[PDB]
Structures are given as C-alpha cells and as structure tokens.
Amino acid sequence: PQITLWKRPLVTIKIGGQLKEALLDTGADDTVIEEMSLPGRWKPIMIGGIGGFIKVRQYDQIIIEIAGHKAIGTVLVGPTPVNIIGRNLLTQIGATLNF
Amino acid sequence: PQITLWKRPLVTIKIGGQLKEALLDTGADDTVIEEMSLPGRWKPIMIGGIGGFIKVRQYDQIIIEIAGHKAIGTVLVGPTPVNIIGRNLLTQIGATLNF
Numbered sequence: 142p143q144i145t146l147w148k149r150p151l152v153t154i155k156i157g158g159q160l161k162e163a164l165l166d167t168g169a170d171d172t173v174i175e176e177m178s179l180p181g182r183w184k185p186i187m188i189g190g191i192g193g194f195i196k197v198r199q200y201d202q203i204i205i206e207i208a209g210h211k212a213i214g215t216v217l218v219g220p221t222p223v224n225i226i227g228r229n230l231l232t233q234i235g236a237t238l239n240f
Numbered sequence: 241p242q243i244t245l246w247k248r249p250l251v252t253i254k255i256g257g258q259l260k261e262a263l264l265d266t267g268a269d270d271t272v273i274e275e276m277s278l279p280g281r282w283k284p285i286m287i288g289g290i291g292g293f294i295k296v297r298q299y300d301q302i303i304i305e306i307a308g309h310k311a312i313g314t315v316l317v318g319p320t321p322v323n324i325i326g327r328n329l330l331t332q333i334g335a336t337l338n339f
C-alpha cells in the first residue's frame with residue numbers, strides 16, 4: 142500500500158508466530174525488535190542510534206511477516222525504544238520512498 | 241522521485257545557507273541536524289532513540305530545502321552523528337512509503 146507520514150508508519154508484524162507492532166524505518170539499516178523469545182541461534186553485536194550504542198542479539202534467516210508481506214532475514218533483538226523494520230527487510234518487501 | 245532502500249536514503253538539503261547530506265528517516269518524529277551556528281531564538285530540549293538521549297536546540301520556522309523540495313518547520317540542532325530528516329518535514333514534501 143501507500144503510507145503517508147502524518148502518523149508513525151506502524152504496521153503489524155508476525156515473528157516467531159507472534160504478532161507485534163513495528164515501525165517501518167527507512168533510517169534504520171537493520172531490523173530491531175524488543176527483547177523476546179525467538180526460535181533460532183544468535184550472536185551478540187552492537188548497533189548505534191542517535192543517543193549511542195546498545196548491545197543486541199543477532200538472529201539470521203528469521204521468517205517475518207510485515208503488513209502481510211513475507212521477509213526472511215536478519216532480526217536483531219534487544220532493548221530498542223521501539224520495534225523497527227529496517228532497510229534489510231524493507232528491500233525484501235519491495236518498499237520505496239516516493240515524493 | 242523514487243528512492244530505493246538498498247543503501248541509506250541520503251539526499252542533499254539546504255539549511256541556514258549551507259548544503260548538507262541528510263538521511264530520510266520515516267522512523268524519526270522530528271528533524272535533527274548536525275551542529276551548526278543557525279541564527280535566532282531557540283529552546284533547549286532533549287531528543288533520543290537507540291543509545292539514549294542527546295541535548296539539542298529547537299528552532300522554529302526554519303526554512304529547509306530537501307532534495308529540491310522547499311519546506312518550513314521545526315529543526316533540532318545538536319551532536320547527532322547523522323543529519324536526520326523526520327516526519328515533520330517528510331510530510332511537507334509529500335513523501336510516502338510504498339510497497
């Protein structure tokens with residue numbers, strides 16, 4: 142669909158078979174989800190944001206549905222202020238910025 | 241135009257008489273620009289995201305051209321690692337997310 146930005150671009154996602162709400166984020170390289178139990182092997186890494194760096198668990202090849210669109214890729218799990226869907230998965234669902 | 245997300249959606253902007261490169265961030269409520277000596281009155285506020293919060297100066301009615309599109313609104317100035325164009329301005333240039 143076409144989503145305007147007057148409101149935060151929040152969509153429903155399905156991960157680990159669980160429904161969550163996430164923010165479509167063009168300014169995010171990666172996808173970061175709040176702490177949760179996720180079936181899969183992980184590796185600890187650090188990511189950055191506007192205020193500094195935080196440590197997250199890196200899960201690869203995770204099946205996730207975004208607004209009904211399928212994506213299978215890297216999902217970072219950690220203490221993020223909000224669930225965000227980054228470019229790694231936005232490209233998978235064919236999302237583009239238009240103006 | 242249409243901007244794909246294979247790489248960071250960076251565009252040229254003009255603010256305070258200077259040209260800079262900024263990130264189109266749909267996951268940002270407001271606009272945060274790198275430290276620059278913008279003239280005029282301002283208000284001290286704090287803004288954040290991943291890693292925490294940072295101190296910035298809030299300027300109102302700032303003229304800013306984004307990728308050739310004129311806009312006018314609130315601009316936060318401070319020690320941000322990246323020039324961030326938020327929704328407050330993305331809506332003004334008619335930007336949408338499409339998939």
Ligand SMILES: CCCC[C@@H](CN[C@@H](CCCC)C(=O)N[C@@H](CCC(N)=O)C(=O)N[C@@H](CCCNC(N)=[NH2+])C(N)=O)NC(=O)[C@@H](NC(=O)[C@@H](NC(C)=O)[C@@H](C)O)[C@@H](C)CC
Pocket residue numbers: 166168169170171172173187188189190191221222223225227263265267268269270271272287288289290321322324326
């Ligand atoms: C988590 C909060 C919501 C999403 C977030 C995404 N921001 C981009 C900004 C660009 C970097 C400064 C970001 O953090 N992107 C990260 C997301 C994490 C990730 N791993 O993708 C990123 O791409 N990080 C890269 C590196 C970015 C820096 N790059 C560089 N210096 N070359 C990384 N780690 O790979 N939004 C924000 O940070 C904005 N905050 C907000 O919109 C809200 N604040 C809060 C706390 O939620 C609102 C209430 O103010 C900031 C800019 C203030 C308006």
